[PDB]
Design a protein around this nucleic acid. Sequence first.
DNA 1: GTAATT
DNA 2: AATTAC
Length: 57
Amino acid sequence: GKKPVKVKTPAGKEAELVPEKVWALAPKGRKGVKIGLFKDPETGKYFRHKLPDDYPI
DNA sequence: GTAATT
DNA sequence: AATTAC
């Protein structure tokens, strides 16, 4: 989990954050998505957010 | 619901 | 429970 991602925080804001952890979330038979774990700087809360389909895992 | 992750 | 989207 290295390169920053443009994400929409729960607080409301657009923000360029670096995920703590990234991984692929896909069922058998389907493409699924890539997901990042992030900490909202506005609140310290944790939240998850889709990554672009070519974000490196 | 399913997939992983925490 | 949440993430996405099929």
